[PDB]
Write a structure and sequence with these properties.
heterodimer, A: alpha+beta, Pdz3 Domain, two-stranded antiparallel ribbon, 17% helix, B: mainly beta, elongated, Golgi-associated PDZ and coiled-coil motif-containing protein (chain A)
């Protein structure tokens, strides 16, 4: 599919509402494995199971190890832009 | 769930 920029709005008291898997140590991109009901990703739409996360708020997640990506993603607050692709 | 997963 196309590379997509997707808006997600996250208050500080809540998570992103996604689970991720994969990462450089496994030879695959950071992939969305789950979208959790009623949380920001679910509410906003636009993100799907199987999407690869290429970047978040301009921060490159390509070639990032699972833990690195967890750290970066978990630091984002407020209006968050995801760059994803379903490939 | 082939690899480790993290909820965010």
């Amino acid at each position: 599919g196309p590379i997509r920029k997707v808006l997600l709005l996250k208050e500080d008291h809540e998570g992103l509402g996604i689970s991720i898997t994969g990462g450089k140590e496994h030879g695959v991109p950071i992939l969305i494995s789950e979208i959790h009901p009623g949380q920001p990703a679910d509410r906003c739409g636009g993100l799907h199971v199987g999407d690869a996360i290429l970047a978040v708020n301009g921060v490159n997640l390509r070639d990032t190890k699972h833990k690195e990506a967890v750290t970066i993603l978990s630091q984002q607050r407020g209006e968050i832009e995801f760059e994803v692709v379903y490939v | 769930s082939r690899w480790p997963t993290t909820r965010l």
